[PDB]
Structure 1
Amino acid sequence: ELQLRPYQMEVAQPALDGKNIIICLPTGSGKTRVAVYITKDHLDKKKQASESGKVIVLVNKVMLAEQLFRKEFNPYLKKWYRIIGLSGDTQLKISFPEVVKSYDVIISTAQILENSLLNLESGDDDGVQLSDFSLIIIDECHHTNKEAVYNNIMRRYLKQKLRNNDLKKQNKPAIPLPQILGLTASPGVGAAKKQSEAEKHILNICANLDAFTIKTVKENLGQLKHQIKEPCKKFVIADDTRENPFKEKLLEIMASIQTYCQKSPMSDFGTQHYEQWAIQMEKKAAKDGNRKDRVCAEHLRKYNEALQINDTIRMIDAYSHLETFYTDEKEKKFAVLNDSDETDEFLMNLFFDNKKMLKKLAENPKEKLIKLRNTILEQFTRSERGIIFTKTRQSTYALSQWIMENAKFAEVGVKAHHLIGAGHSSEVKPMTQTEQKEVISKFRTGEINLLIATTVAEEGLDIKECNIVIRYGLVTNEIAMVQARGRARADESTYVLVTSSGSGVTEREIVNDFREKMMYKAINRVQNMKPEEYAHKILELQVQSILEKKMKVKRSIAKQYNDNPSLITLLCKNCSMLVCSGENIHVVEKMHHVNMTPEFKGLYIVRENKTNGEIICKCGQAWGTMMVHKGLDLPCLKIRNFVVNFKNNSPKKQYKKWVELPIRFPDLDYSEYCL
């Protein structure tokens, strides 16, 4: 039943017989079907060869593993051989080492295999070796980078390959090495200005992947051009001339607070440099133990980010963010007072006094939003799907709120939903993988006609067809832009970019376009190179990478060696008071820290407002949570909100992290808490 096409033959013909190589075709070129066909051919050759045929497929994203399991690999290969799809979300509840030798076909994230090999080296588990495999297939090869996961696996493979070469000169016996295949569309450039450097980056990629070729289509390219239609390019610009009243009022309060705290701005307002200066002032205040330097800095930061989003988000969202922050602060203050400095009262009373007028001033008119609405609605009328790319998740939420609230979209009847990434990213609600999964399914079937997504959807997150692809103030790198452009896969596509004229964004878009042109100019060059000098370059890059990794591991071992028991005193950053000693702390689960002595309980204050409570200091500085672990409600504390004081010279140092502290703490002896 398997079906194929000419360009697929031409690209995949070399790999049919050895030739561990890479393949670079645009999106929607059937690369997945190429891969399944190649795997089938390899397994057939093994069977007719009376040799063990093992195939492993590696994908950076978890979803794509199940996607290939459901759509391409299993349907076209179910009957001939045994197949399985692994992932972190999925329970590989047997084990990796033997399922490698139980199904002959593995589809798993690279991290699982990497963990298995590390376990083997540690000797804790029997583990697995690459020799057990006969064919490795890697999707999204462009991620093979300085020390990415793919790069780690390939560095192990290349060390084995160098050992085998050395033996070939020394001893005939050698460890067999499985074939390697790579799939990609935009290999990318490591920020190379000279085309020579771009080719150097391409050769580095090839050496990491041991491809020895690229094998891009050259004969039937016309057929691909006919089948694939590139979206029409559209540029959109804007200027922030309006917004004068409320911006002016906010800047007036800005200047007032600054002069009150006498902060030299050392930079222009509304920029990342100012935030960095604010953080430097935070650190200085920590090293000095004074107030009036950090609360003001955080408030300035909140105002700055509010202003930044205002240029790209409606003022209502910024006002709500600020109000929520101040309400949380006031709840903190009320709790601390309930248990029972002038600048804090100044800030809160300033905001309270001007709260009503600020609300009235923000509610009034005086935007990219109006023109975005114009473009989207006129396009929808002309069409009778849609994707938005932005910077931060709350921007996606604001866009969803805007499209729901406005009645014009309801008149059009366009369906929309907000999609974002997972995990915790500094005050953005983590999103569950399953939730993203039903969102993508709902969009796939048709109910959602508009999908708002962050960089996650830029890569992978494959869809059959997306008619409209519009980016909104998001330009990062050539790979992101090109993959977003190719994600349309529609017969007729509209690629739009929206941003501010003052900001350097259109320049970035054209830079990515030139990077694509340069990628072609370099890929065609490398495809035409002398085999001897070529292989020489691959060897040089391989050996250099292996050596660099070896020195890096040596310096990682040599960097962390102190591990002293107790040589410090931990204080509260906000109020320089002795909070804990260097030994009273105890470790649990080899990851968390806690203080158990009741003397510590007599210092801090417990607070809960909302299923684990949080801790606060006498000065209102948040410390941690009340972890419920194996019965015990242990008070876990975050070093992110503390200060250190060594026993000698008292050099104050803030780490925002535990491992960055070279000295280790003792584990929790439950026997110390008997009765």
Structure 2
Amino acid sequence: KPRNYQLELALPAMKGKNTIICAPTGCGKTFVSLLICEHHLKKFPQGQKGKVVFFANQIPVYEQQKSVFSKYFERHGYRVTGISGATAENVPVEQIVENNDIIILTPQILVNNLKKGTIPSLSIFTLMIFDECHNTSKQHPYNMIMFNYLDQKLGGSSGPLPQVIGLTASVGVGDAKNTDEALDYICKLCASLDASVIATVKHNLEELEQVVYKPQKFFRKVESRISDKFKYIIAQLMRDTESLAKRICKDLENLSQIQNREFGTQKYEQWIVTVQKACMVFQMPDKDEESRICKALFLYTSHLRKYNDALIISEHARMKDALDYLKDFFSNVRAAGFDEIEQDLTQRFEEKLQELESVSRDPSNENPKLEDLCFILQEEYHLNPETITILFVKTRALVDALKNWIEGNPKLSFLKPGILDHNILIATSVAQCNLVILYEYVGRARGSKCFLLTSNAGVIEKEQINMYKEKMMNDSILRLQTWDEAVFREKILHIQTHEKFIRDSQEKPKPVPDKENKKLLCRKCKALACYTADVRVIEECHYTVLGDAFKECFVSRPHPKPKQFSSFEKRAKIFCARQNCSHDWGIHVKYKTFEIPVIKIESFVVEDIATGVQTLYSKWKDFHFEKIPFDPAEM
């Protein structure tokens, strides 16, 4: 039943103006959107038909919205449907939009349609409902739809424009420090979404917080370990590896010029990636020993990166977990390669393992952060044995490490694995949620706690300034609601005019393609893969090769997760067809009836025939050449 609370948010939208309706409850926002849809479709006279559209960004929320809209809008006789990645194949989306009223298509589908030519004008709709509209920041599908909307509006051909009624939970601040910058950011959001009112409950505050978030904070700053024998042994191993890596590259310290680097930090991983991407462009004229040098440097650098990841895991998670990670990596790479370099590194790690295993089993080397984590878990469960806790972790390499720790720790047995009956649900990013534990990470059950565990004061200061930013965002929302409509509409119109101007400004023309027939080579092998004259672009995003000689240059491998995406269907991945390379080149797909190995320029190095410079690109867009379109008439 619609209560007065759900109507105090819908009143500013039923009048016929664009809003930024915001509520902390999901069910509340859904019911408000349903009431707005009902009041908007029922207000039209006879002869006209409404085409309200809903924008869900995720598949689960899309399914929930489609289900609730189909169950609600039944007695009214409105055709409600939905379009996603599993429905926009060989269906005339124009026929779906023209013959429906409450379509709930995802925003990427509407962006693709507006780009293709289907649905030329955006005036076909009469009410747009953006779900979680605080994502309208930059280049987002919501922002691209709003760019088309503002271009058709300010362009001087404004037709029957639709209402752009939004829906969010937090208006968001971004990186504002003073109240002026937060007000500017909220005005920029309201301009990009083109709304004149920010609906927020200012009358019904009594029954607001009965069944809402109502969180709490229990910051717990901890210290790191001191008896770091494992870190010392791994640092000695990495120093030996880096020392024996300089036998072929004397200026390895010269290739990456940033600062002093230390083992076990993200800066070391960045230095590793930089020295990898810098030593992969050698131009030795032998082209035979140069391949061995590049492969040896790639192997040493991959081993250093794995050791650095193991150090970070041992710093955050347990020691046995980092040891298991290193053993798993070594066992996985042992079956792929059999060269003397891999043998040397594996035998060195095996020599160190006889002592690393004894060091890991030492009960006096337990992490203190895991210690007081299990302590606070024990005390909170002794306080209440029916608490469904969620433990957020930064890396996905630790969501399973902490699960193994919970399953192995004898001091606690009441917990169950809940990697995302299941008591604790160890997740990474997003129900009851009776307890949250942000472990090194930077809405119900009134009485729930939220413990933040970290070994750095940085996260504590960031959470403090985040609470201050939430307070200042509430104050700025009150200040904006205090304003009238005229000056606010003029301000948002000026903001969107300036944004349209600066957007028309940054228009990069077509870069002049090189008429030279440059070629591609593997990363860790430097073997001739294919000439760029043999590369065909499929849909301005995907690239493939049609050469018969290229068909034998790779080897297929079953994909761990195949899923078709509106154009193709995945079948397998492709690897380099050498003795001990096994380098990830791309993915094998089917377009309509053919089998095509679509490659990625990330795992490739470009070599020119004119000069001979070896360039390394990241994405296809940065790579400029004669993009020959895919011709099905050939093969």
Per the TM superposition, whether the score is higher than 0.5 is yes
**Partners of 2:595 and 2:162 in 1: how far apart?**
51
Counterpart selection for 1:468 from 419, 435, 442: 435
Write the mapping of 1:166-205 to structure 2, written as runs, cut at 5 A.
Answer: 166=156, 174-205=158-189
Contact 2:133 2:166 in 1 (8 A): yes
CA distance change for structure 1 residues 579 and 625 in 2, over 3 Å: closer, same or farther?
Answer: closer
Contact 1:623 1:637 in 2 (8 A): no
Deviates more, 1:617-626 or 1:490-499: 617-626
How far is the alpha carbon of 1:383 from its aligned partner? 1.8
Given the alignment of the two structures, is residue 541 of structure 1 paired with residue 541 of structure 2, yes or no?
A: no
Match of 1:284 in 2: 278
Match of 1:321 in 2: 325
Match of 2:71 in 1: 75
Q: For 1:351, what is the secondary structure of its paired residue?
A: helix
Contact 1:607 1:615 in 2 (8 A): no
Given the alignment of the two structures, is residue 654 of structure 1 paired with residue 608 of structure 2, yes or no?
A: no
Match of 2:40 in 1: 42
Contact 1:563 1:663 in 2 (8 A): yes
Contact 2:336 2:580 in 1 (8 A): no
Write the mapping of 1:300-379 to structure 2, written as runs, cut at 5 A.
Answer: 300-334=304-338, 344-365=342-363, 366=365, 367=367, 368-379=369-380
One-letter amino acid matched to 2:347:
N
Given the alignment of the two structures, is residue 132 of structure 1 paired with residue 124 of structure 2, yes or no?
A: yes
Q: For 1:617, what is the secondary structure of its paired residue?
A: coil
Write the mapping of 1:492-511 to structure 2, written as runs, cut at 5 A.
Answer: 492-500=447-455, 502=456, 504-511=458-465
CA distance change for structure 1 residues 668 and 399 in 2, over 3 Å: closer, same or farther?
Answer: same
Write the mapping of 1:26-175 to structure 2, written as runs, cut at 5 A.
Answer: 26-28=24-26, 30-46=28-44, 48=45, 50-70=47-67, 72-91=68-87, 94-120=91-117, 125=118, 127=119, 129-163=121-155, 166=156, 174-175=158-159
How far is the alpha carbon of 1:381 from its aligned partner? 2.6
Given the alignment of the two structures, is residue 615 of structure 1 paired with residue 573 of structure 2, yes or no?
A: no
Match of 1:6 in 2: 4
**Partners of 1:645 and 1:536 in 2: how far apart?**
54
Match of 2:521 in 1: 571
Contact 1:28 1:489 in 2 (8 A): no
**Partners of 1:356 and 1:319 in 2: how far apart?**
12
Q: For 2:260, what is the secondary structure of its paired residue?
A: coil
Match of 1:484 in 2: none
**Partners of 1:139 and 1:626 in 2: how far apart?**
34
Write the mapping of 1:619-634 to structure 2, written as runs, cut at 5 A.
Answer: 620=581, 622=583, 624=585, 627=588, 629=590
One-letter amino acid matched to 1:417:
G
Counterpart selection for 2:397 from 394, 399, 415: 394
CA distance change for structure 1 residues 128 and 595 in 2, over 3 Å: closer, same or farther?
Answer: closer
Q: Output the TM-score relative to the length of structure 2.
A: 0.85
**Partners of 1:228 and 1:363 in 2: how far apart?**
46
Match of 1:267 in 2: 261
One-letter amino acid matched to 1:73:
F
How far is the alpha carbon of 1:45 from its aligned partner? 0.9
**Partners of 2:633 and 2:121 in 1: how far apart?**
42
One-letter amino acid matched to 1:42:
H
Q: For 1:391, what is the secondary structure of its paired residue?
A: coil
Given the alignment of the two structures, is residue 217 of structure 1 paired with residue 209 of structure 2, yes or no?
A: no
CA distance change for structure 1 residues 626 and 118 in 2, over 3 Å: closer, same or farther?
Answer: closer
**Partners of 1:9 and 1:576 in 2: how far apart?**
66
Q: Runs of 5+ in structure 1 lacking a partner?
A: 168-173, 420-446, 458-462, 476-487
CA distance change for structure 1 residues 387 and 131 in 2, over 3 Å: closer, same or farther?
Answer: same
CA distance change for structure 1 residues 510 and 359 in 2, over 3 Å: closer, same or farther?
Answer: same
Q: Output the TM-score relative to the length of structure 1.
A: 0.80
Q: Runs of 5+ in structure 2 lacking a partner?
A: 247-251, 254-258, 284-292, 560-571
Given the alignment of the two structures, is residue 382 of structure 1 paired with residue 383 of structure 2, yes or no?
A: yes
Contact 1:136 1:178 in 2 (8 A): yes
CA RMSD of aligned residues (A): 3.1
How far is the alpha carbon of 1:387 from its aligned partner? 1.6
One-letter amino acid matched to 2:97:
V
One-letter amino acid matched to 2:482:
N
Contact 2:574 2:587 in 1 (8 A): yes
Q: For 2:139, what is the secondary structure of its paired residue?
A: coil
Q: For 2:104, what is the secondary structure of its paired residue?
A: strand
Contact 1:140 1:184 in 2 (8 A): yes
One-letter amino acid matched to 2:380:
Q
Q: For 2:87, what is the secondary structure of its paired residue?
A: coil
The superposition leaves residues 437-487 of structure 1 with CA deviations (integer Å, 9 ceiling, x where unpaired) of: xxxxxxxxxx433323222x2xxxxx3x32222222111xxxxxxxxxxxx
How far is the alpha carbon of 1:249 from its aligned partner? 1.0
One-letter amino acid matched to 1:569:
K
Contact 2:24 2:213 in 1 (8 A): no
Q: For 1:177, what is the secondary structure of its paired residue?
A: coil
How far is the alpha carbon of 1:150 from its aligned partner? 0.7
The superposition leaves residues 335-383 of structure 1 with CA deviations (integer Å, 9 ceiling, x where unpaired) of: xx6xxx6x55542331132233222322333122222222223222322
How far is the alpha carbon of 1:92 from its aligned partner? 5.2
**Partners of 1:468 and 1:539 in 2: how far apart?**
44
How far is the alpha carbon of 1:182 from its aligned partner? 0.9
One-letter amino acid matched to 2:575:
E
Number of residue pairs matched? Answer: 595
Q: For 2:105, what is the secondary structure of its paired residue?
A: strand
Identity of aligned residues (%): 34
The superposition leaves residues 38-91 of structure 1 with CA deviations (integer Å, 9 ceiling, x where unpaired) of: 111111111x46532221111111211111233x43333321132534242542
How far is the alpha carbon of 1:250 from its aligned partner? 1.0
